Design a protein around this ligand. Structure first.
Ligand SMILES: c1ccc(-c2ccc(C[n+]3ccc(N4CCCC4)cc3)cc2)cc1
Ligand SMILES: c1ccc(-c2ccc(C[n+]3ccc(N4CCCC4)cc3)cc2)cc1
Ligand SMILES: c1ccc(-c2ccc(C[n+]3ccc(N4CCCC4)cc3)cc2)cc1
Ligand SMILES: c1ccc(-c2ccc(C[n+]3ccc(N4CCCC4)cc3)cc2)cc1
Lengths: 354, 354
């Protein structure tokens, strides 16, 4: 039960005391409870709570999550979080201030990578993603994020000056593919691949999926999608394909490079069909009433869409990871991860015949 | 039908094209319609619309309001607006970006000052305010805004160096009252005056109240409260008292000083009772089920609360207006308005025996 720095205890006390109603408003500092959930220099997380000896007066929460930003994107993330809260699709928003926010505390654990392929879990992930994809949001609907971001990252990658010989070497190999050519060939392929533009999560991986406490044996509604920091209007195919890619990566590996990759854990076509069979009726209400025939066509075309867009997930994250090898302060094998993503890019390309 | 500057037409076109769905996404610039609703250097307003010859594809609006900011408060105002939109208490939010936002266009006119005293109108204002006062919001609940703001303004007022002799003269008269003494005597009075802390509009005047098109002959639900720029947790008494004060001021007067003030248009006790008789059942659901006796006590105590807090409305706006005489760029008799507010402050004080 890790205690925060005294400075952070006092600030957390004041934010809770001033932003939360009822018993919080009169709470003594010496009866304030706080423990560190995630440390670091940015995006730090703390649990704050009333003493067990203090009764609630109304509907105020007894326990909350404090998120600290630490080390216009802020306007947009805050507005998004507030709207998702109002719509019961994310944790409630209790307080917002320059340094962070107070959010609803949701008893839960994160999923592990192996759990993504469980048929019931996968079905519910698909339903939750489809629900998210139906959200009308006050943000730019031109789907510029995907290629805008890859172009931005590639610009950065070509200008990196590594000093470490192992990274110099790995970078030269990755750039030997002619990444500008490959990106513009990918742009050509996806231009010819229909995919509706919807509000996408953009990071649907096990670490962003809560298994809700007390719901673990429930048939449905045991999950919640969280961490919408990178959510935007984007091609639907990307959100689904990106999720499929995440079946292959275990970030809990406790030896350098601090991930495991397995190409054979990508969902099989059978598994992919199971996922999209749950997605579609959740996204298009009367989908079930279509003939078995029309449903089959729509499913086949979606399989093609999502597996092509999976290529963009590899390329995007490969580029992202090279930049992180230059700019990150976390211990992680970023260059080896980049190579894993580009390996999967070319393996997938070959399987698609593209 | 005033057209905007070409620069603004092009930016408005792009914001509408990129943030609004359906027919907007493919709209040609030469079929984009825009007209200026309010000009100026800040908070400019434009109406944007589809051509009549373009059909809607889905549920997209045919007409919207563009608000431009022009010349962390922004995070908070945006989050507030988004939440009020979600809760159906304000116009929908269609787009948010650094320079402004796209809002729902609400066919309507503003009320005139004379209309505030109409019994049906006043009853509905009271119901809408009570509804607003029930809103739980993610903002600081310590009621520091009222006196914090008056102290801030008074600091500014004491440091103003006017160059215009008529303003030098008017300022000397207003400061001759010993405003620090008077403010701290007001703080003492209000400290002893119970008033619940609720989410307040803080500017409930006729210019911020829409009379909804086609609802003018409807028994109820003909109004909408707008312009929450200054909304905050605050003493309930202030929101109601401030509204009552606004019965006395007509800002449509077309000769200098560009307002009329009439002390005799403050609501009579009968009118005040009519207002609070609508407020209470809208704020406290089972209020009607109380005995005539308990209801009468609660009403009497509220009359006292609100008329004491009305003094703060005078003092706050008096101070505010002196600062505006120094810093504003609008033609308005700010010093004469300040004197009108302090005149009403002392007149009200004398009637209260305080
Ligand atoms: C070891 C431990 C944690 C991390 C890590 C920490 C935080 C994040 C946050 N993040 C999530 C999604 C991101 N995206 C980049 C564009 C697509 C989505 C970028 C960054 C990603 C990875 C990396 C290595
Ligand atoms: C590429 C490389 C690594 C990862 C990744 C690695 C680890 C994790 C789990 N995780 C561990 C630590 C995290 N943080 C530590 C402090 C900042 C946030 C956030 C997330 C999630 C994602 C994602 C993409
Ligand atoms: C002539 C025409 C318009 C105006 C005017 C224009 C905009 C506003 C906006 N405003 C609304 C409320 C304000 N408050 C100050 C603290 C209480 C609420 C301050 C400013 C107020 C007055 C003043 C003179
Ligand atoms: C003290 C003094 C004047 C007023 C007041 C005066 C006029 C109005 C009506 N009004 C007229 C013009 C307004 N604007 C013009 C460009 C910026 C906003 C806004 C509001 C509303 C309030 C309010 C308080």
């Amino acid at each position: 039960d890790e205690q925060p720095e005294p400075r952070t205890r006092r600030r957390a006390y004041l934010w809770c005391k001033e932003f939360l109603p009822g018993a919080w408003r009169g709470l003594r500092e010496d009866e304030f409870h706080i423990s560190v959930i995630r440390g670091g220099l940015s995006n730090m997380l703390f649990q704050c709570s009333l003493p067990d000896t203090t009764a609630t007066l109304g509907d105020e929460p007894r326990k909350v999550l404090l998120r600290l930003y630490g080390a216009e994107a802020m306007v947009l993330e805050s507005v998004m979080f507030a709207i998702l809260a109002e719509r019961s699709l994310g944790p409630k928003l209790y307080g917002i201030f320059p340094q962070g926010r107070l959010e609803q505390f949701i008893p839960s654990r994160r999923l592990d990578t192996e759990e993504l392929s469980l048929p019931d879990i996968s079905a519910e992930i698909a339903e939750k993603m489809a629900t998210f994809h139906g959200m009308k949001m006050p943000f730019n609907k031109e789907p510029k994020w995907l290629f805008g971001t890859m172009e931005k990252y590639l610009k950065e990658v070509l200008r990196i000056k590594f000093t470490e010989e192992s990274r110099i070497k790995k970078l030269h190999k990755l750039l030997s593919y002619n990444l500008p050519l490959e990106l513009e060939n990918l742009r050509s392929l996806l231009e010819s691949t229909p995919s509706p533009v919807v509000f996408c999560h953009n990071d649907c991986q096990e670490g962003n999926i809560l298994l809700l406490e007390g719901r673990e044996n429930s048939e449905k509604q045991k999950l919640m999608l969280i961490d919408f920091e990178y959510s935007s209007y984007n091609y639907r195919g990307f959100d689904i394909g990106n999720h499929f890619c995440e079946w292959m990566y275990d970030y809990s590996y406790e030896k350098y490079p601090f991930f495991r990759a397995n190409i054979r854990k990508y969902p099989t076509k059978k598994q992919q069909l199971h996922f999209i069979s749950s997605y579609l009726p959740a996204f298009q209400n009367d989908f079930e009433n279509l003939s078995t025939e029309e449903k089959s066509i729509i499913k086949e075309e979606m399989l093609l869409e999502v597996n092509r867009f999976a290529l963009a997930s590899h390329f995007l994250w490969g580029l992202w990871s090279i930049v992180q090898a230059k700019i990150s302060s976390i211990e992680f094998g970023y260059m080896d991860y980049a190579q894993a993503r580009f390996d999967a890019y070319f393996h997938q390309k070959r399987k698609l015949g593209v």
